[PDB]
Design a protein around this nucleic acid. Sequence first.
RNA 1: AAGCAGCUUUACAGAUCAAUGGCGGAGGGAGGUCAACAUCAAGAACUGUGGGCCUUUUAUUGCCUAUAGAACUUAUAACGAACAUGGUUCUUGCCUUUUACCAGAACCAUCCGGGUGUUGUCUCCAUAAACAGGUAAAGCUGUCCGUUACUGUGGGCUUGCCAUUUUUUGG
Lengths: 150, 201, 134, 73, 112, 97
Amino acid sequence: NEWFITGSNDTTMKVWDLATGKLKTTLAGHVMTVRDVAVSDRHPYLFSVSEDKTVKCWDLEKNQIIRDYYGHLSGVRTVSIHPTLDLIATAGRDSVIKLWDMRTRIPVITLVGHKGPINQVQCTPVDPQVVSSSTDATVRLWDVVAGKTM
Amino acid sequence: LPTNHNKTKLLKSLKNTKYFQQTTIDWVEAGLQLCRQGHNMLNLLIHRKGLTYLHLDYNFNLKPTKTLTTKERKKSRLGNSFHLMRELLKMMKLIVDTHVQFRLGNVDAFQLADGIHYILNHIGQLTGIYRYKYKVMHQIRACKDLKHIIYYKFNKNLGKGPGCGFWQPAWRVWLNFLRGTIPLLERYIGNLITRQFEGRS
Amino acid sequence: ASDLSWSKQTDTGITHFRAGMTHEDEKLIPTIFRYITTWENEFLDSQRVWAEYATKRQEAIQQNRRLAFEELEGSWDRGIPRISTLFQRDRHTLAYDRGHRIRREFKQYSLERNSPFWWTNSHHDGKLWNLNAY
Amino acid sequence: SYNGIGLKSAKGSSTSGHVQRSLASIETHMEKREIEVQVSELRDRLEEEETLSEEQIDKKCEALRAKLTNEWQ
Amino acid sequence: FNGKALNNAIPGGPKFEPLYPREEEFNSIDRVIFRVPIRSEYKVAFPHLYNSRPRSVRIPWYNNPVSCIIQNDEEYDTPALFFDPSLNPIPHDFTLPEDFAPLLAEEEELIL
Amino acid sequence: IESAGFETDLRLSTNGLGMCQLYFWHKIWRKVPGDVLDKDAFIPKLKPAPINSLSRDFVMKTRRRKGISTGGFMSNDGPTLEKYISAELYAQLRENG
RNA sequence: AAGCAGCUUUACAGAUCAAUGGCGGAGGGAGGUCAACAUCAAGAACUGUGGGCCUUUUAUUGCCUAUAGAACUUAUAACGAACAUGGUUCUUGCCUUUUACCAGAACCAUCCGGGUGUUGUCUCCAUAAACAGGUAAAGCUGUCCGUUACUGUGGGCUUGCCAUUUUUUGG
Ligand SMILES: O=P(O)(O)O[C@H]1[C@H](OP(=O)(O)O)[C@@H](OP(=O)(O)O)[C@H](OP(=O)(O)O)[C@@H](OP(=O)(O)O)[C@H]1OP(=O)(O)O
């Protein structure tokens, strides 16, 4: 709780301070509107979905981009770091959640079944491990193993 | 720093199959066979795409047989990868052909060494690798720079003229270039050959 | 070139020379600044040649002769404005031209490609340089 | 930049960067001092030769001082 | 490494980009005694003294002792141990057994 | 003040064979040539000062470091007149003698 | 360091030809452009065994001590006394957009390679090594076999030597 980072439409995430309200740093690696920011719980990372079609990892021991998760078919809207594994859940306009292993930057498990663009994805440590929701008015609960909506 | 858990190598991973076989041949025969096989592989890369009018000469000069369409200039342009293969095989064929002109009895060993030192310090003139990969210019400059040292320590009491054939450090510079662009060409030609067989993702 | 830790402090003498555009040849290409007369060397000369012209005009009024321009040759291309303005073919028309400096200076607010010679006007000042010797 | 003269880089200026060196470049006071010196000398003498008691040396010194004063007007 | 990190040339040495773009009362000519013009060889030799604001500067190897190696360059004519022409000259009962020998008295040859 | 790297000068002139060791245990102190009170001494700015105007230099710049002077002009030395000679008779006798 | 005494050794002359006890043996040496597994960037930094001490139940952490070992690189720090290339981001150049680039940084990587240990295989040269239990591995152990445990010749040295106050020639 030393800080909170607010990604904004001027492409520049800014790291503000809780107790004082000060800037400390500005993270400006995107070129499009930064839509979602998700800081990791057990990693010193900062995953920043923008609509650059890029999911960028920010190493907070360095304040540098280290990983760029390519594979999205359109703009991305949300991150969801699975809190007790090493994968992130990114989904957006292309109506499909791509899970990403954080080491190998591979789309590990595609999650097929939402119709319209997906707005907000949440991950739980126990199945349903992806609680996602889209513009087709469906909150789908996902099986990460089977790849099917439970 | 090199990787420490690299137990895998390239040729050590190819001895352990049933397809490659160990033998002992002359170096000149190995060079002539890599020229023949490189000509066959680049000729088959050309001929799978349908570029049968690009008569890849035996000295690895890609020349169109006839003047082209634009459709026969779109399929017949190729990237830095295929041309980089073509230019390194031009370089290697110049090396092996000067050793052949030695081994045939035509040219002297001193004139072989000067011919090799001419090759390894005129790759940017004799071959054309500078076009398709421009950081080769680094090594080309280094080869020129080694020329500029060696011709004024070989020629203290000799003045100006051909005859210098101390080709060792320029040879090292081009081997270090090949050390750098083995995995580059592995990835480039792996992507090209999987576009030829598997196709575009 | 001079010491860029010292050059932002004092008027350093020109202690070094960085090479401008070196070619492999030793071609000493002449530069335009040597073929343009500098402003002090134009203005002292302008005061001299206009003192000479006002003296020759006072004498030609005293001699009651009209000052033909076969005498001022040699001083025909010296002085700001030029002596060659005084015997151009439209001097009676340009007698009534006033405010031409700012008219030529505010062309940049109404022309898309103004001439870069916004300041000079060869009808009123003449050619202030000659690069046919360059 | 040798001697801090040259460029940051030859790249950027589009020059050769060949930086070459240019071939174109009181009496009373004195008296007092003397008196003091004399006194010191006297004291030293006293110390040297039979003057463990102060009164003697002091007396002699005083006399010397007086003499000096007399000498200087 | 010091010549690279300090934007600084050596006569035999190579030139680089500046590693740091460095721009702009204390160190003005009003307060500087100009006796020794600080050549860049000082700034590479003693890099922390002659440089206001160095960083990423590796500590240079201060000298080895004075190697007084005799070169023996006379036509294979001199022995291995002799007094070289460049060497400066030097301006300065009890009994034992007869068979008490020095150590290595069995061999005569000082050199081989 | 003149040995700012005499050691590297002996090493780079002799191409590495020389060796210099500067030391100050026999604590010798020599007069700088030139007067302190020489206000008519010329002071260059980028080349080093000449010999007969050295000490006037070596005073002044150190004064500008320590704030006892009042700017980068040739005045503000240490005069007799600032310390005690304030009445005009002492000043005129010192300048008239 | 000539010799003698002593100790040890092999070639032995010898006592038993026993029960002993040392040493050596209970399936070799040199290697090879042979590969397989480890291992190689660090509190200057490593493990083996054993004890003891701390969690709220003694579990995975982390220390203090005792000894036996640390091969390989490492200080002008690094497996390599040599040196390429690629990715991301930032800052320059060329600029006419990108690839291809100029060239510096930071963080990462990818390639040519390399060392050491062990296992195995292969090549060349040789040749009481018998039986029984196991492990990831060995004479590891039990039975067992040669010189041989009690003298002398021949070699080696780990030693000593070649009475008059403080030791060994008398209170
Ligand atoms: O033109 P120059 O300035 O006189 O230099 C040339 C040139 O060297 P550069 O590549 O540096 O220009 C030649 O190289 P190429 O023309 O072949 O490219 C080289 O001849 P070789 O490469 O054939 O050896 C020759 O060297 P030399 O004639 O001594 O063999 C050398 O002349 P310099 O020795 O005077 O520099």
